[PDB]
Amino acid sequence: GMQYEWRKAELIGQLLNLGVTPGGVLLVHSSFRSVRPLEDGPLGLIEALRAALGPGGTLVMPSWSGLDDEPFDPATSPVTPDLGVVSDTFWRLPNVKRSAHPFAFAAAGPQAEQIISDPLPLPPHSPASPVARVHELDGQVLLLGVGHDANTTLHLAELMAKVPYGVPRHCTILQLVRVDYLENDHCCERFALADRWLKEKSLQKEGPVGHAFARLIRSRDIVATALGQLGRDPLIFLHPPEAGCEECDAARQSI
Ligand SMILES: [Cl-]
Ligand SMILES: [Zn+2]
């Protein structure tokens, strides 16, 4: 009811207290519904993120469409509604770059060109994808009002582990020429296991940003931790057949 509208300067303080590194690279998965209400809305949250990073920092967000039948255009193609209003708002602002493939990210800062430059990666989160360019630049991953099921960097860890499962997906690029690949996609619910893995090793910082429960982990810690669990169980992220997950049993089928 009478919830507090967070000011921009307050959000910067929360982000610094959470542990965001000024001048660093920060990949942010967000749900604005969790952070809301704020004064000045989603742009205010973006301005707070950019201010916490400072002029040397680079802010990165997912920015893909999800439409496998439609070609992607970095100038008009909207972000899928599942990534939130902040992601769909970030890429439209001035001087923020965007990848030129349907699995795009958006980045603004002195490092945006390096994180965005790569062509279409198959699977979408391969070692040649923006999520890997954040990892090689020692970036931070901010989970803003979302769980680890949205931690895209975990998908990169599956690919680096050479994970056995791979279901066929597809997309469209202009040369309507369908491009199918083998992706490691599932319900992603079991990604929440990484929460206990990381927090217990003291690798996950937790705190409030706005009204949201926020989690901040170094991208290298996400990959290194997950690679150890994947090295013990390549199917650690797969629901057992007992749980009867339709999205997970499909990945089990394709070896
Ligand atoms: Cl949202
Ligand atoms: Zn599942």
Give the start-to-end residue ranges of the domains of the chain. Answer: 1-255
Q: Which residues are annotated as a binding site?
A: 187, 239, 245, 248
User: Tokens standing for 166?
Assistant: 């791979």
- Residue 196's contacts (CB-CB under 8 Å, 6 or more residues apart) are none
Distance CA 71, CA 176 (A): 7
- The DSSP result for 159-217, as a single string, is HHTT-S--EEEEEEE---EEEEEEE-----GGGGHHHHHHHHTT-EEEEEETTEEEEEE
- Quick one: resolution in A? 2.4
Query: What's the CA angle centered on 213, arms 211 and 218, to 5 degrees?
Result: 135
CA dihedral (67, 68, 69, 74) in degrees, to 10, reads: 60
Which residues sit with Cβ closer than 5 angstroms to ligand 1, an ion?
A: 32-33, 84-85
Output the CA 32–ligand 1 centroid distance in Å: 4
Q: Experimental technique used?
A: X-ray
CA–centroid distance, residue 61 to ligand 1 (Å): 13
Hey, what are 122's tokens?
A: 């198959």
Give the Å distance between the CA of 102 and the centre of ligand 2.
25
Looking up tokens 């360019």 gives: 133
Binding residues for Zn(2+): 187, 239, 245, 248
Distance (Å) from CA 55 to ligand 2 centroid = 41
Chain breaks of the chain after residues with C–N above 2.5 Å: 175
Angle at 122 between CA 118 and CA 85, to 5 degrees: 70
Residue 51: which residues within 8 A CB-CB, separation 6 or more? 8, 12
